[PDB]
Write an enzyme that holds these catalytic residues in place. Structure first.
Site, mmCIF file in Angstrom:
data_model
loop_
_atom_site.group_PDB
_atom_site.id
_atom_site.type_symbol
_atom_site.label_atom_id
_atom_site.label_comp_id
_atom_site.label_asym_id
_atom_site.label_seq_id
_atom_site.Cartn_x
_atom_site.Cartn_y
_atom_site.Cartn_z
ATOM 1 N N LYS A 164 0.818 -1.210 0.000
ATOM 2 C CA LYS A 164 0.000 0.000 0.000
ATOM 3 C C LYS A 164 0.854 1.263 0.000
ATOM 4 O O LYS A 164 0.617 2.183 -0.789
ATOM 5 C CB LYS A 164 -0.943 0.004 1.203
ATOM 6 C CG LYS A 164 -1.998 -1.072 1.194
ATOM 7 C CD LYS A 164 -2.877 -1.000 2.436
ATOM 8 C CE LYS A 164 -2.381 -1.903 3.543
ATOM 9 N NZ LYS A 164 -1.323 -1.294 4.349
ATOM 10 N N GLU A 190 0.298 5.692 11.112
ATOM 11 C CA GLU A 190 1.327 4.940 10.365
ATOM 12 C C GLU A 190 2.685 5.211 11.027
ATOM 13 O O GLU A 190 2.683 5.846 12.074
ATOM 14 C CB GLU A 190 1.142 5.250 8.878
ATOM 15 C CG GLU A 190 1.804 6.548 8.476
ATOM 16 C CD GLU A 190 0.866 7.544 7.826
ATOM 17 O OE1 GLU A 190 -0.361 7.410 8.004
ATOM 18 O OE2 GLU A 190 1.366 8.434 7.123
ATOM 19 N N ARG A 191 3.784 4.716 10.479
ATOM 20 C CA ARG A 191 5.120 4.853 11.126
ATOM 21 C C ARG A 191 5.606 6.311 11.132
ATOM 22 O O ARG A 191 5.357 7.002 10.152
ATOM 23 C CB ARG A 191 6.091 3.936 10.390
ATOM 24 C CG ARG A 191 5.802 2.448 10.508
ATOM 25 C CD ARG A 191 6.780 1.640 9.680
ATOM 26 N NE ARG A 191 6.477 0.217 9.659
ATOM 27 C CZ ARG A 191 5.497 -0.342 8.965
ATOM 28 N NH1 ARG A 191 4.716 0.404 8.210
ATOM 29 N NH2 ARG A 191 5.302 -1.645 9.015
HETATM 30 N N1 LIG Z 1 6.324 -2.582 -6.208
HETATM 31 C C1 LIG Z 1 7.252 -3.090 -5.395
HETATM 32 N N2 LIG Z 1 8.463 -3.387 -5.910
HETATM 33 C C2 LIG Z 1 9.391 -3.895 -5.102
HETATM 34 N N3 LIG Z 1 9.314 -4.170 -3.801
HETATM 35 C C3 LIG Z 1 8.108 -3.865 -3.318
HETATM 36 C C4 LIG Z 1 7.044 -3.335 -4.025
HETATM 37 N N4 LIG Z 1 5.947 -3.154 -3.198
HETATM 38 C C5 LIG Z 1 6.370 -3.567 -2.031
HETATM 39 N N5 LIG Z 1 7.661 -4.014 -2.028
HETATM 40 C C6 LIG Z 1 8.420 -4.517 -0.889
HETATM 41 O O1 LIG Z 1 7.543 -5.186 -0.014
HETATM 42 C C7 LIG Z 1 7.331 -4.404 1.173
HETATM 43 C C8 LIG Z 1 5.987 -3.746 1.135
HETATM 44 O O2 LIG Z 1 5.998 -2.659 2.077
HETATM 45 P P1 LIG Z 1 4.940 -1.495 2.000
HETATM 46 O O3 LIG Z 1 5.363 -0.411 2.970
HETATM 47 O O4 LIG Z 1 4.706 -1.044 0.618
HETATM 48 O O5 LIG Z 1 3.666 -2.198 2.585
HETATM 49 P P2 LIG Z 1 2.335 -1.758 3.331
HETATM 50 O O6 LIG Z 1 1.158 -2.471 2.852
HETATM 51 O O7 LIG Z 1 2.277 -0.241 3.308
HETATM 52 O O8 LIG Z 1 2.644 -2.153 4.786
HETATM 53 P P3 LIG Z 1 2.433 -1.603 6.244
HETATM 54 O O9 LIG Z 1 0.966 -1.839 6.525
HETATM 55 O O10 LIG Z 1 3.249 -2.524 7.109
HETATM 56 O O11 LIG Z 1 2.835 -0.174 6.315
HETATM 57 C C9 LIG Z 1 8.520 -3.457 1.299
HETATM 58 O O12 LIG Z 1 9.481 -3.954 2.214
HETATM 59 C C10 LIG Z 1 9.137 -3.417 -0.099
HETATM 60 O O13 LIG Z 1 10.520 -3.705 0.008
HETATM 61 MG MG LIG Z 2 2.003 1.153 5.175
#
Ligand SMILES: Nc1ncnc2c1ncn2[C@@H]1O[C@H](COP(=O)(O)OP(=O)(O)OP(=O)(O)O)[C@@H](O)[C@H]1O
Ligand SMILES: [Mg+2]
Ligand SMILES: Nc1ncnc2c1ncn2[C@@H]1O[C@H](COP(=O)(O)OP(=O)(O)O)[C@@H](O)[C@H]1O
Ligand SMILES: [Mg+2]
Lengths: 471, 56, 476, 470, 119, 118, 119
Positions: A164, A190-191
């Site tokens: 996300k 969020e962080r």
């Molecule tokens: N399009 C992408 N290309 C490469 N690596 C990706 C991609 N999307 C996510 N990742 C990897 O996978 C992880 C996804 O993290 P991200 O912050 O995008 O997730 P999130 O859904 O926002 O999580 P959270 O709820 O924990 O904040 C990251 O560590 C990143 O390294």
């Molecule tokens: Mg996130």
């Protein structure tokens, strides 16, 4: 006198008793300013928001910060108005918190600047604007199957760690430099690391100069996480309704807002609803999401990341938010683990919004052919699991052959993912996206190894990548 | 033909071995999901019952 | 006394002390000018539901009696407006100018006050009108899957009523207000707005109004039905009304039940939907047909409220996303969808042509499933499979493209009388398009006969016309 | 004496009595009130006493809407439970839960015999205990679920599987033949369906021997609680005083328990499992035990029972099972395949099939049909992948007949013409047992499987295949 | 995970309404408070550091459970250890596919960066 | 514990069905009216198990070692009672009817124990 | 199970705390009290005996209800009858694999104990 005293303290919830006939309204802000007059106390600077009229001159309120150190009998002051925050050109380039106080260390805001109340009713039926135009983003899967509407609402659903935040930052990179109007970022739950990291990326960008910020993160108590969204919305609303600008609005997690609401509904004395949430979940979601709209005076485009508590999409908060969104993208851990980023599940896509007008002749035929092929592959996958591809019919084997290609070509290399992988990202236009998927559907590239399709931009990069691989 | 018949029985043997292994793995993961659903259902029912009694 | 004082306020609820002569279900008004409704008459306090913004109401404020059970304005002036569940306009065109009211809570017609449903309501959709017909006085549930056309079905049905002497009431419950404005501008263009009256309860509104909206719509509809008109009411997101009622009950501290819904949750929609009826000739012969709409997450039918509504209505139309993505539009599942009046709601020609179609199509789906495994087939089963494939093709249609019933019957006659057996399956859609053009050009006597007598034309003339077209047709 | 209203919470009303003359439990109370001014409405309402509280107070359940009641209104204790007319005067009429005719044909005279709704059930010495078979004319039933004369029949099924169509077909096939009285009770189901059934009875002429009582979905829970007991009292009179044979049709007796659970929380009970009232089995047994035949007469009771989500472990169906002599369980999978009536051929225990009566001819055919259909279920998951090749020799002989037996168990109903485009058929048990014996002997393996669908006699299958061109 | 079970026990004794898996609604805040307090301080604040390594015990390798998803959504990455890998003799059993460090790559030494890519 | 602490020796404690102990605790919690935890168990499941199990240890003057028979409520090892109990095991021993039929007594096949203790 | 339902109704009407399916905390103890009165007395006590056969009707094969599990844990064995066996022609339809008796062997005469093992 217009002052009360603390009667009860129960975590984030405080009970305050006033004099007869001087009870504050339901959303009024209250102030506790206490000097530690003895070494067995501490000093206090706390602000409360009224929530319920309890009867017997007593009010129940929600604290905007930690209530540690409160004592029964402290003096409480009524400000006479809801929480009010600065608005105008003065907010550009600044970082704030839930109370509208800057936290960027560039100095205070003048005491006489204009500030607007955080609570207000939504725009009237006769003021709304209802026109659909597509918002090109440069992401193949979106711009083909889930295309965003200028002036509408967008929802990024996903579990934990699925993509996300990266997706939202690629959208900020693809849109916000070009946009020309004002923009607002609101970080809810969020962080705090990610708020610091975003501020420095923005700063260098001088996109900080227009765009900057309000924050209330996972460290904050529930009161602040319940209202930072309204603060950011107020600052966006001023630019929409006072200057006619087109405004971008990013919200890094809107699920944490309802989670914060349910963390106080219990201490407020309300019976739990399904799965323990507050009984007012839909009303509080609606009152907030109805103010993010486009009127005739200006427009608001809002992009909202939505956490699904476990990998469960029937959870009440996501399920209730589904009714407010003009487009939705659902991210799946299965794709994220197969290595497909952005990891969007192509079917859900508010494929309703896509369909009718814009795409409806050229792009609609390609988008529906893609979804039909991925649906049939999804039907076969069950039997493919037990027996493999050896028992399929020869025409049902071609479906697998091309669905693998289509599924891999839907993934892309993002600019913001360069910092994970040395590969630089790509921006792909809608025409090229439609072109490439049309050729794959016709069979022009049925000979290339499926690996050539992974993490590329235009369809030509697939050819060059396979040639590099040695085909 | 004697070569072909030998190869056919070896091929069917390998295919049915792989099919059995895949089915066993599917059974394992399906039992995991079944137990998760069973536990969640019990918790939801007991919570509803106690919440009604509390409100009363 | 006929006044009281507020003792508690919050979350759209208030308690009052006094109001000795208040009735159960009465209207009360606060000092603010906001309205409320007395739901609970406790021994020493009254539980009130606030029908407006409550942030201006404070403890100690006075509350007044009005002497009127909960009411709603009704009359020919609501026509062409957009109106709040209390009859206050929101479109901005001035006052509505009604002259009488109806209770929002009223008794449904008895066993002897009704007549059997016997006259059709045309939606213009072949699949609906042929497989799951809807009659005047019927209640049918339309339950879809967000990306499938469920929402558009009822707006198309309302627009298709433009020459049939219907009156319409669109009820938008818990919807987003820019979607209600988009519906109003769609209907406006159609001049269908000019019949449609429209009640709106957008999601920013307090829970009590979302709980009241469908009752206001039905109460405005029965004004015309008991005068002898024919009314069509569409309920949008009727599960959002259930959520609003759950909110109200939990805030009034009624203990929860299954999930957290009250025990009255079935009776809510039962009251609502039992008011739709076909009145007897001794009552004027008016009618009121209801089309509730439910949207499903991932196609789950086993949802609590949707199952209750299924148990209340006269049939359901089911649209599935797998059918939608495989190319079946509208994505109507024939095995899962039924009508409980079917046949009596079809004109005689439609009864003659499509009386067995739904059972045939369900059996065909079963045979198609069994034949994939089945390593052998014979002549009769192959013939059935071919006819099923042609039927599936014939029932496909585009969004917003209504078809008259007379044309529907002629195409279905061609299908069921074996006239398409030699046409390739991939050619049936184009065959139908050109057949409609040929009918326009050459079969006006046939179309006029069907239209004026509701019966089939002469069989031999029909076969001759079909065979002449077949001669003119070119296969791919 | 006189009481006053104290609280009003939807269907439940609290009344206080002054001089220590509390009404007994189950007594009826009347609130008759003409408006004192233009700020009131006229009230004519009936309440049933449910609980005694302290401080001279009673909880009651309203039998109509409670809108308009004010605190302080006067309440009259009638001194007895709800009482309804009994006898010939009830034949041909339509009543509500209170014994008021809702047809337009007049009003019952004031002096007529009028019996109370609450009553103890018959004792162990006076119960009838012999089994005679009842022929319905429906192939699947008469073979695989025979009904008992004077017994209890339950038709289980989830929403939209065909319970009401089957109830109407049973009325159509049995009521005209019956040499007794019929009683119908509509409990919480569709007023449209009630109007349909009444007009069909009228046109047939059977209505001259039939009493009908309706409390439908639009009623408050008190009416839906007591309408079944009103109908039961009307049937008990004919069983007892006239010694007649009675047919008692109840449509969705599940709504009786559902209405009880609607009121329970307002009465103040703690919830039981799955949110039902703690007194579910007790309240259900109170009603069910009165519906039985004795040495003075018989009641043949056919009830439709709703299964909330096809989940047969739900407490309401689970408790109903212990009261039934025979059951039919309807299946959604068959309904979706287009196999109507859609009876699940196993679940019925065929219980009357209780070996003796059927035992020589009919029992061997019935058990051989069930064995063939059991094997086909086990085959269906094998069948898909491995099975259609591997089964194709040995087990396809079972599958080929199971497909045809399953299509031949369906039938075309008289009351289903608006759904089938056909008139109905009536199959006697001899012909049913003959036809299924032929299919099992393989006399019809050559006819296409589609010819077997929605017919009556096996000669009709032969004719349909001929028409198809076999 | 054991701290979360203890806090849940405490909350049920105070009779707070339970939610998913009987955990209170505040369980996310319980760990967000704690894990937000590790940080890398700027040069104005002294430049100190505090790095946390929380452990969570799953039941059958299920990463989609409530508590594991909460903590994953709080931290900057996870190291997933597989029981079968531990039993096969690979005791430092790091499942390379599911485990990731979201901010740690920029902190490797250049010598390690120059050889880790091929590995 | 008396013999560990007074006589200074190594003792053996056998508990036939720790599951029945946890089940009795759950029944008592329901009787005292506490709010149930996940899967219906008492909120104090882990504390009660830990208070029992933490008193079985080796001291400087002796030890207690416990053989405990454990019933898995539905052959679900992730159920709370088996999980909380397995959180304390140092070893395991399984008995096989196949070996008992082959005539191989004791009939043992005790694999998990290899990994920690051994 | 019907005795258990009657007791649950009484205890809810007397307002006692509810348990797993609204059953009270002493529902296990009710049936333990009942079923432990069936015993084989020692000769000094007379040599009499009392054996109990509780019977339960299932709704498809499900024995996972709370009361059936309690009674299963209290008794010495269970005999299982299945409709799948009953329709396939095997009557009385006992599932010998799933059924168990824990006294078995000691409850047979010598002639039977000689020939039942091979069977
Ligand atoms: N399009 C992408 N290309 C490469 N690596 C990706 C991609 N999307 C996510 N990742 C990897 O996978 C992880 C996804 O993290 P991200 O912050 O995008 O997730 P999130 O859904 O926002 O999580 P959270 O709820 O924990 O904040 C990251 O560590 C990143 O390294
Ligand atoms: Mg996130
Ligand atoms: N015997 C039958 N023949 C044809 N269609 C049937 C038959 N029984 C049921 N149906 C179909 O099923 C629908 C629902 O049946 P209904 O009597 O309402 O069952 P229930 O009362 O269980 O909901 C009917 O409207 C009809 O379309
Ligand atoms: Mg029915």
């Amino acid at each position: 006198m217009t002052r009360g005293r603390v009667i009860q303290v129960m975590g984030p919830v405080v009970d305050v008793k006033f004099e007869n006939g001087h009870l504050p309204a339901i959303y009024n802000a209250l102030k506790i300013q206490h000097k530690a007059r003895n070494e067995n106390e501490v000093d206090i600077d706390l602000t409360l928001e009224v929530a319920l009229h309890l009867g017997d001159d007593t009010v129940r309120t929600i604290a905007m910060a930690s209530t540690d150190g409160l004592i029964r009998g402290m003096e409480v002051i009524d400000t006479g108005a809801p929480i009010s925050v600065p608005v105008g050109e003065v907010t550009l380039g600044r970082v704030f918190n839930v109370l509208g106080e800057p936290i960027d260390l560039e100095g205070d805001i003048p005491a006489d600047a204009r500030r607007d109340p955080i609570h207000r009713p939504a725009p009237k039926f006769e003021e709304l604007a209802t026109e659909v135009e597509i918002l090109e983003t440069g992401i193949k899967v979106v711009d083909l199957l889930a295309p965003y509407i200028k002036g509408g609402k967008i929802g990024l659903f996903g579990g934990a760690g699925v993509g996300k935040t990266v997706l939202i930052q690629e959208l900020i990179h693809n849109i916000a430099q070009e946009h020309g109007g004002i923009s607002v970022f609101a970080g809810v739950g969020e962080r705090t690391r990610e708020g610091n990291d975003l501020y420095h990326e923005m700063k260098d960008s001088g996109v900080i100069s227009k765009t900057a910020m309000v924050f209330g993160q996972m460290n904050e108590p529930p009161g602040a996480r319940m209202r930072v969204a309204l603060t950011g919305l107020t600052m966006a609303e001023y630019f929409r309704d006072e200057q006619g600008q087109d405004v971008l609005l990013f919200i890094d997690n809107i699920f944490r807002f309802t989670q914060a609401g349910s963390e106080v509904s219990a201490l407020l004395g309300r019976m739990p609803s399904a799965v323990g949430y507050q009984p007012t979940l839909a009303t509080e979601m609606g009152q907030l999401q109805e103010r993010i709209t486009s009127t005739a005076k200006g427009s608001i485009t809002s992009i909202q990341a939505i956490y699904v508590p476990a990998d469960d999409y029937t959870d009440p908060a996501p399920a209730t938010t589904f009714s407010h969104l003009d487009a939705t993208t659902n991210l799946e851990r299965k794709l994220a683990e197969m290595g497909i980023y952005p990891a969007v599940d192509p079917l859900a896509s508010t494929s309703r919004a896509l369909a009718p007008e814009i795409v409806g002749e050229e792009h609609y035929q390609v988008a529906r052919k893609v979804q039909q092929t991925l649906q049939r592959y999804k039907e076969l996958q069950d039997i493919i699991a037990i027996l493999g591809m050896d028992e399929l019919s020869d025409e049902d084997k071609l479906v697998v052959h091309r669905a693998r290609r289509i599924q891999f070509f839907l993934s892309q290399n993002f600019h913001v993912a360069e910092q994970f992988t040395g590969q630089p990202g790509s921006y792909v236009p809608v025409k090229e996206t439609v072109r490439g998927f049309k050729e794959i559907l016709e069979g022009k590239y049925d000979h290339l190894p499926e690996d050539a399709f992974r993490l590329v931009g235009r369809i030509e990069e697939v050819v060059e990548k396979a040639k590099a691989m040695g085909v | 033909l004697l070569d072909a018949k030998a190869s056919e029985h070896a091929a069917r043997m390998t295919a049915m071995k792989n099919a059995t292994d895949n089915a066993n793995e599917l059974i394992r993961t399906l039992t995991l999901s079944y137990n998760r659903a069973r536990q969640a259902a019990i918790t939801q029912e007991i919570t509803e019952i106690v919440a009604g009694a509390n409100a009363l | 006394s006929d006044v009281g004082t507020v003792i508690q306020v919050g979350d759209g609820i208030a308690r009052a002390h006094g109001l000795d002569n208040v009735m159960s279900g009465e209207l009360v008004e606060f000092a603010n000018g906001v309205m409320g409704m007395a739901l609970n008459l406790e021994e020493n306090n009254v539980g009130i539901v606030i029908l407006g913004p409550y942030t201006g109401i404070k403890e100690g404020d006075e509350v007044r009696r009005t002497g009127r059970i909960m009411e709603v304005p009704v009359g020919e002036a609501l026509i062409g407006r957009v109106v709040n569940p209390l009859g206050q306009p929101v479109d901005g065109l001035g006052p509505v100018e009604t002259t009488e009211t109806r209770p929002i809570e009223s008794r449904a017609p008895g066993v002897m006050d009704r007549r059997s449903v016997h006259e059709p309501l045309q939606t213009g959709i072949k699949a609906i009108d042929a497989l799951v017909p809807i009659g005047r006085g019927q209640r049918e549930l339309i339950i879809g899957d967000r990306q499938t056309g469920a929402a558009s079905v009822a707006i198309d049905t309302i627009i298709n009523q433009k020459d049939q002497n219907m009156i319409s009431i669109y009820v938008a419950i818990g919807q987003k207000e820019s979607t209600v404005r988009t519906v109003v501008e769609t209907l406006r263009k159609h001049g269908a707005l000019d019949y449609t009256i429209v009640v709106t309860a957008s999601a920013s509104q307090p829970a009590p109004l979302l709980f009241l909206a469908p009752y206001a719509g039905v109460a405005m509809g029965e004004y015309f039905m008991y005068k002898g008109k024919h009314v069509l009411v569409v309920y949008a997101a009727l599960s959002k009304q259930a959520a609003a009622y759950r909110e109200l009950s939990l805030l009034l501290r009624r203990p929860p039940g299954r999930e957290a819904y009250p025990g009255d949750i079935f009776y809510l929609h039962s009251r609502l939907l039992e008011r739709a009826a076909k009145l007897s000739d001794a009552k004027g012969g008016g009618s009121l047909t209801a089309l509730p709409f439910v949207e499903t997450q991932a196609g789950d039918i086993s949802a609590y409220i949707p199952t209750n509504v299924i148990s209340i209505t006269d049939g359901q139309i089911f649209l599935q996303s797998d059918l939608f993505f495989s190319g079946v539009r509208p994505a109507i599942n024939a095995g899962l969808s039924v009508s409980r009046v079917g046949g009596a709601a079809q004109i005689k020609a439609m009864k003659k042509v499509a009386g067995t179609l739904r059972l045939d199509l369900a059996a065909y789906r079963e045979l198609e499933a069994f034949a994939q495994f089945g390593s052998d087939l014979d002549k009769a089963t192959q013939a059935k499979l071919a006819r099923g494939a042609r039927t599936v093709e014939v029932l496909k249609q585009d969004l917003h493209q209504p078809i008259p019933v007379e044309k529907q019957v002629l195409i279905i006659y061609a299908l069921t009388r074996g006239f398409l057996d030699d046409i390739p399956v991939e050619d049936v859609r184009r065959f139908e398009k050109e057949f409609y053009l040929f009918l326009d050009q050459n079969g006006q006597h046939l179309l006029e006969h069907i239209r004026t007598t509701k019966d089939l034309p002469n069989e031999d003339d029909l076969n001759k016309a079909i065979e002449a077209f077949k001669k003119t047709f070119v296969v791919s």
